[PDB]
From a paper:
In the case of Ty3, Gag3 is cleaved into CA and NC domains. Formation of the capsid is important for genome protection and is an essential step in the retroelement life cycle.
To study the structure of PR- Ty3 particles at higher resolution, we collected a 2D cryo-EM dataset of the purified particles, identified the icosahedral particles by image classification, and determined their structure to 7.5-Å resolution using the RELION single-particle processing pipeline. The particles have a radius to the center of the CA layer of ∼24 nm. The location of pentamers confirmed the T = 9 symmetry identified by cryo-ET and subtomogram averaging. The reconstruction showed clear α-helical densities consistent with the determined resolution, as well as a disordered internal layer, which may correspond to NC and associated nucleic acid. There are nine different (non–symmetry-related) copies of CA (one in the fivefold, two in the threefold, and six in the pseudothreefold positions within the complete Ty3 particle). Comparing the nine different non–symmetry-related positions, the fold of the individual CA-NTDs and CA-CTDs does not change, but their relative orientations change. Notably, the trimeric appearance of the sixfold coordinated positions in the EM map is a result of adjacent CA-NTDs existing in two very different orientations [Fig. 3A, orientation A (cyan) and orientation B (dark blue)]. To generate a structural model for the complete PR- Ty3 capsid, we placed the models for the Ty3 CA-NTD and CA-CTD from flexible fitting back into all nine independent positions within the complete EM map and modeled the linker connecting the CA-NTD and the CA-CTD independently for all nine copies using Modeler. To assess the conformational variability of CA within the capsid, we superimposed and compared the nine independent copies of CA, showing large relative movements of the domains about the flexible interdomain linker.
Author numbering:
A (entry chain F), E (entry chain B), G (entry chain H): 37 to 191
B (entry chain E), C (entry chain D), D (entry chain C), F (entry chain I), H (entry chain G), I (entry chain A): 37 to 195
Amino acid sequence: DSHKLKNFISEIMLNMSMISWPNDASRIVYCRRHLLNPAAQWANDFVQEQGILEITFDTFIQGLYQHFYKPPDINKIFNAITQLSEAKLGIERLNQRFRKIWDRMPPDFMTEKAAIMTYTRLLTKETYNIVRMHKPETLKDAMEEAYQTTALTER
Amino acid sequence: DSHKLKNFISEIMLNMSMISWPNDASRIVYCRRHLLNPAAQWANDFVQEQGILEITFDTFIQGLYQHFYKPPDINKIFNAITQLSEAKLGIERLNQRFRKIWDRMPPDFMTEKAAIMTYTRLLTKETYNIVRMHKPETLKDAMEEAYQTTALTERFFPG
Amino acid sequence: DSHKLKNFISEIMLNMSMISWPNDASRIVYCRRHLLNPAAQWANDFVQEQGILEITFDTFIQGLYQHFYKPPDINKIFNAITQLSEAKLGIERLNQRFRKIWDRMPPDFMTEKAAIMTYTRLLTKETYNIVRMHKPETLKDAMEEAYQTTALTERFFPG
Amino acid sequence: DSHKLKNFISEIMLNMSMISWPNDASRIVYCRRHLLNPAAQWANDFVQEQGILEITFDTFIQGLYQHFYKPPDINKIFNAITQLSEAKLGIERLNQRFRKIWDRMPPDFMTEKAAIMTYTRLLTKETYNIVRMHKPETLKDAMEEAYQTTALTERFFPG
Amino acid sequence: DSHKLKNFISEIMLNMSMISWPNDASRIVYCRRHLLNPAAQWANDFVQEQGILEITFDTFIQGLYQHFYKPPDINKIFNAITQLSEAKLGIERLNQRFRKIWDRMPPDFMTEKAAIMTYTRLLTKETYNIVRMHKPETLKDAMEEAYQTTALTER
Amino acid sequence: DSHKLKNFISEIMLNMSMISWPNDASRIVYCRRHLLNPAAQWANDFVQEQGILEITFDTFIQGLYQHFYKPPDINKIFNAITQLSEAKLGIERLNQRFRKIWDRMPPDFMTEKAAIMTYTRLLTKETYNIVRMHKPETLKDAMEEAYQTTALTERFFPG
Amino acid sequence: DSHKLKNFISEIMLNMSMISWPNDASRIVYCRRHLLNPAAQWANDFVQEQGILEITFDTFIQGLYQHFYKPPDINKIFNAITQLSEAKLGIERLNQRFRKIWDRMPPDFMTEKAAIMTYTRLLTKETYNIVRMHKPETLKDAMEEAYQTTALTER
Amino acid sequence: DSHKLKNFISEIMLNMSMISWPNDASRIVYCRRHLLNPAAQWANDFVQEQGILEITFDTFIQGLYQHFYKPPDINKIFNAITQLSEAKLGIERLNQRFRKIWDRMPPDFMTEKAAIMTYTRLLTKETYNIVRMHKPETLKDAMEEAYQTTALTERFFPG
Amino acid sequence: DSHKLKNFISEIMLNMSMISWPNDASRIVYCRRHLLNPAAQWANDFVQEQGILEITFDTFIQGLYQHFYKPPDINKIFNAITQLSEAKLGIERLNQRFRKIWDRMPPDFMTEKAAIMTYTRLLTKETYNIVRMHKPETLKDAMEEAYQTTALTERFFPG
């Protein structure tokens, strides 16, 4: 439920972002309309609890953030990661599959170098070569590099 | 159908609650739009029956309340509970299946120790052993313990 | 055609009801737009026949009411009722089947005792015994009693 | 026995009513004379049981009321009604048979249209045709019509 | 002879009761006319014995009461009670038969609960069920209940 | 296709008639939206052919009139009518079959008495008797009468 | 592309025609929205080239007319016309087939009498007879007449 | 996919350009609506990745540019060009086939004389003769000349 | 050589840190004394290269930091870790083997929870059970727990 919910919040925030809002009170309330029943129930209670007009949109999202917490299911995520080999047709499958798995469920997981070691080891030895020359600093860069070389002379 | 319907009414009422309504007539009618066919059919007939403009939103919900509710002491839940054995592949099936059945339909059912006795008896004798050492106090803890030991040295994930 | 038409009128009337109308002439005319061809043809003729600006929305609906006065001629319902025997597996089939048939099409049919006599006679002699002790006053009570005794020491559930 | 008995009491009470009685004791006793054996047996015992001169005429009738007037169960009457088909030779059998069954035991049963639907459905399809043209409003009219057409171009007489 | 005689007295008393009597002397004498020979013989002697005009109608009936009352034998009554089973067609036979037997011959017999236990045990197990729900407090109530349920729905 | 099309045009024209139009160009174009594919194809071509802004709504309807003047069909309808005898099981088949055939394809055909003569002659001599007593004035009344007498002392139902 | 484009312009012009426009500038611009990429590219360039607010809707359509009308190959159209005989089942095939071929590609082709001579010669000798009595003045009338007689006693 | 995509971006940008935008946030988002599924998937992820309200419309298009701008595969185009011989039946096949291949994928390729040398060499020696007398200056002229001589004393037509 | 060298630098820096230095020149030079031959050779050259009195102690250590840079080890370490299964006889082999591999080569590697996940997953499912009840917070605790339960109720090897 929680992974979808994290996505849900981002999007809603974006939609709100482009267009102009005339005041904060309207905006905090508007969030409530999209929500699903237990969350919606919670929302009512939270609105009551605050006797003030509101306390900002961000505060309210943080109560939601607080709401959606899984116990750390690190094993499932590790296991998911283990499954991918290079029998997955080319870069594209891997990149999209990895995105879903990785992005969903980390609270802070492992450090930046570690994330690159895990991502990189999985990749064909050839692809590590080009990507090494010159190196990515982040997982998005690694993924963008591998896809770009494959995609450019293909796609 | 009735359990979902009770939830449905609550939510609808909430949605309505936050925002402002300019008059009652609109509001009573708006309820009709969300409803499903037999209920919707009933609704039309009820609207006709009242020759007045309306009689309040609450009245209309009470006709719905009247339409479907479960009586107290519903054996169906016991029977549902009886069906599960350990032929259900591992913890995961049982935990999810039990959640649906148990969570739906109790007004106050039975006490906390009793709920643990019923949940626990169902479980493999082996699993009761580990779970015993050290004990859960609530049904969520029992369920979390059994799943965690199985899941940890096993498992896959969602998304 | 007539049963749908009775529903159609109710709804249309409701839609109209919530929002405000500035004058009657517009409202009577607006009804014509939704209608289907023969009815629509009739409508034109009726509008002509009245040389006055209009005579009220209600009058016009009454001409429609008149156009299809009562949907059943009590026969089909009796016949439907006749069909059920006790070859229908147990209470559950009968209760659900009877609900559909009975609830649909009565304007006022027969009196309360009569409805219980017809419902009760149909039931197995055994079931009448328990139900007699102690008696139902309404068809819903009879149906609830028969189902409850069968269901309690038996049954399964929905969702 | 009970339906006749309820009639019997009413009449007896009426006869008594018009003329003057000089005292209650005579009147209570006089009731006993008309009664039939088991009831009469009961009566003797009841008179003994009351050591006082009497307790009023009404009290004694209430013991009789107690003795047989029970609320009727519609089922026997429905069942009776069910038995007739058109294998009963012509109108005459049906009309007389129906009279006995129907007239005995209704407190208010079912409404007027319903009574005509039940009576009419039973009749041959042909006879419904003539009777329809032009319609009866009451069960006596239906019965009179069916008999009259059959009788007129047929029949014999009593005495 | 005595059981019939007790009935006889009641009736005679009733007949007398409705209509008016102009004086007591006539009334006491009139009783003598209906009576049968030994009793009638006794009556003559009693009338002589009283040198006064009369001593009241009631007194004279009490001499008759005195004449007839003999001690009963409970065993015949018990034995009578024993005979009934449920081979007697339905409630009606039993109720009428029991009335005759029970009502005749008790001076004080047994207590109220006991009388209900004896009456009730005899009845079909089914009938005890309905009658139990809700209970009779007296033998007349038990008898009225059983008859009413049977009677009401049919025959 | 043509009979429905003649109806279609009338209705569309009516709908347009009640409300106000601000200019002719919009109105002529709006007709195109409701139309079905071959007709719609034609419409495009016709719009092109006229280099002027438009030539009136009526002109455009006349091109449609022209399109479905009629194929020879009165004969087909007569022939269709001829086919029914009383070998068709009872009233129900005939009434439904006749409805389809008759209702489809008349622009004005024959007069009201004539329509009753054709309908009535077809019917069994017996049924004409009851229906005569008392007479129908319209084809719907004749059909309703014949069905009602048969249906009442007989019948089953839909859903 | 050009035949469709000629149709496209006509229609667009019609849609515009019925409803009211408050000013010319809006109208000229609105045309651009419906157009497809190369044409759309051209449109941008043309709008720039005119430094004035606009020069009328008609002018802009003429640039489009200019775009599409290239020289047509009259031979192909003649050849197309030659192919039809009376082996085409009845009027309906011919009329529809002729419409497509003729309507597409003429800038001014041949004169009105000539167009009737070409259309008429193609038709069965019988049909020319009825159509002669009384004559059509335009190709649409000829086509309507032939179809109407066939269609009426048929269709 | 990439060639179409480059066109797609240009156009979208143009449409946006003429009319006024009230703020950047709306505009960046609006781009997402037109896009096709994988690209759309990417878009969602990119929007999330930027925690700020947005970073400009242009930035977002650059991520798309990044996604599928392949160098035009000059080799593929050359290779395509190589395949045609004069075994292709006459001018018509060649002209249409060449149009597709050539027109798609050049950013600036080669100069005008070169394009004529490549086009001309491919053609039958005979056809070069007539076309020479008198010469084409552009590829469209060469193509038009060759087709016209063949077509004129030959040919068929479209529609 | 590099791992020891990183340790060496830290320590030297510490020793220097506690006590006071009167000037930077002395301090930079003093570092040279502890160093081993190739590094020492480098040092001389570096001192010459700087014509200024010195550039700070930190700068000089950075040249050393620069000197260490080996190709990355972490892969080898992961691979080493991968090799162990439970085919290694009991706890003792694993614990000692893991100690060597893990302790050597991390600069900061991964976080504390991660290190426990990697250590724990490797262990037999049974051993995770006891160790879970009650949990270790550090890798030394996990290792001590597993060894203690095995060791306590076991025989140890003589040498």
